[PDB]
């Protein structure tokens, strides 16, 4: 009821009308504990536990910290564009622990948590690089039950290559019996990237919801896509047309304008 959730897929305007309405909605929006990942916690409202996570474009690593501390993840692969100074003392398997993950170091010492860090200058750390997957695949666990991709990009930028890294993992390196949830940070100002998800990733799942956390900025087109129920028969067609996908994006932005105009966005 207070939760902003729009089904990604489940008598409609033309793509030209949708694109024009979206441009107007984006113009209107534009004019309108630091370690806690509040946004990801709101996205994961229906879930309470995961065992093996693959967290991509993690930045400081607050999403990985949430999955370990609150969701009880025992094995986690953490990719981030942030490298660390060589003088920091805490390491996990020779790689420098991100500052945000220092509270979980005792779990690694007691053998209760396996963290696989992909934050080194000696590795490829940009998931949009064409050789990232080959560089890291022998270190990525192939039994993940949750995959997250939290990259921040500028508005309007095509994010297809970030989504492509997740598609590569799903099509080459997961156990279809164990993958339960895929979470992507998306930008609704990036229509090419949204349509890429509709063509590539969304047809692999039985459920998909766009969620706008209360802790996500009222002016940003940032939303999260929560995909679940990986299908046991691989579809050879999309769940919906590009026109239906554009209409969903327009509906989500209309609901966001409505929320922001009434004045409600939590941060401090």
């Amino acid at each position, epitope marked *: 009821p207070h939760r902003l959730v729009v089904p990604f897929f489940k008598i409609e305007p033309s793509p030209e009308e949708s694109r024009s309405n979206i441009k107007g909605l984006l113009q209107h929006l534009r004019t309108m504990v630091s370690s806690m990942h509040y946004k990801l916690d709101e996205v994961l409202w229906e879930y309470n536990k995961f065992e093996s996570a693959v967290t991509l474009a993690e930045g400081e690593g607050s999403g990985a910290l949430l999955l370990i501390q609150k969701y009880g993840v025992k094995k986690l692969f953490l990719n981030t564009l942030a490298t660390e100074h060589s003088i920091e003392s805490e390491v996990i398997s020779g790689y420098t622990t991100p500052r945000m993950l220092l509270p979980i170091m005792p779990k690694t010492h007691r053998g209760e948590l396996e963290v696989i860090l992909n934050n080194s200058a000696s590795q490829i750390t940009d998931i949009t690089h*064409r050789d990232w*997957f*080959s560089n890291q*695949k022998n270190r990525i666990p192939n039994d993940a039950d949750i995959i997250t991709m939290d990259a921040e990009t500028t508005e309007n930028l095509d994010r297809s290559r970030l989504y492509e890294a997740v598609y*590569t993992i*799903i*099509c*080459n*390196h*997961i*156990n*279809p019996k164990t993958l339960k949830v895929v979470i992507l940070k998306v930008f609704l100002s990036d229509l090419d990237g949204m349509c890429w998800i509709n*063509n*590539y990733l969304a*047809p*692999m799942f039985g459920s998909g919801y766009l969620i706008k956390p209360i802790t996500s900025s009222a002016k940003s087109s940032e939303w999260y896509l929560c995909l679940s129920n*990986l*299908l*046991s*028969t*691989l*579809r*050879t067609t999309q769940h919906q047309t590009q026109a239906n996908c554009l209409h969903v994006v327009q509906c989500a932005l209309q609901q966001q304008v409505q929320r922001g105009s009434y004045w409600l966005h939590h941060l401090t």
Partner: nanobody
Amino acid sequence: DVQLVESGGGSVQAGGSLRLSCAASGRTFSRPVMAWFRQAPGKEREFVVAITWSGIRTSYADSVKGRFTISVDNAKDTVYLQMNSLKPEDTAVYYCAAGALPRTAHYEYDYWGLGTQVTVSS
């Protein structure tokens, strides 16, 4: 680039079986939907079934239901097609194809093997 090599074809008596293999090399992860197609003389290329390298299968063509099975050995970069209860109508050149997306049209796959002949005698 992806390179594909099919093997396991040949002549077989009606009612018999064959097991085709498709050894893939190159950037296999970038075209992770591996499909089997077949083309009978004078006929168009027919989609048989496809699987991701992770093991997710599409549904099978009605003409092969209950007889053919696709499988993968991801560690060996090989895809297999088990072909049982073969009949003369199954005679065709069988091809392995690698694509970015699961699609039934041959033109949606940009990498192909040279094919392996399968001949089922009456």
